[PDB]
Amino acid sequence: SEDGSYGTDVTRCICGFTHDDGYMICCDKCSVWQHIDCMGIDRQHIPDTYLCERCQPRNLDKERAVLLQRRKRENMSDGD
Ligand SMILES: [Zn+2]
Ligand SMILES: [Zn+2]
């Protein structure tokens, strides 16, 4: 209805691919869920207050993040 929309936690990862890994983080500012490996963060060192590329003054390799999660789903095609 034309009033609003309730749904804070929204998975808008820059790779255009949703939760399959298990290794994700919520963006404290704009409330968007992204994959750790996508934002170039180490899964060994996970920050509390995550920011995504659009919240960070630094430009993260968004294209490279697409390449990783894309080739991931391309690789998920078993058979001969
Ligand atoms: Zn991703
Ligand atoms: Zn953000």
Class of domain 1-80: alpha beta
**Which run of H or of E encompasses 26?**
strand 24-26
Contact 14, 69 (CB under 8 A): no
Rounded CA-CA distance 7/13 in Å is 16
Which ligand places an atom closest to the C-alpha of 37? 1
Q: How far is the CA of 47 from the centre of ligand 1 (A)?
A: 17
What's the alpha-carbon Rg for the chain, to the nearest Å?
14
54 residue type, one letter:
R
> What do you get for the CA distance between the two ends of the chain, in Å?
48
Q: How far is the CA of 10 from the centre of ligand 2 (A)?
A: 11
What distance lies between CA 39 and its chain's CA centroid? 7
Domain boundaries, the chain: 1-80
Rounded CA-CA distance 40/61 in Å is 8
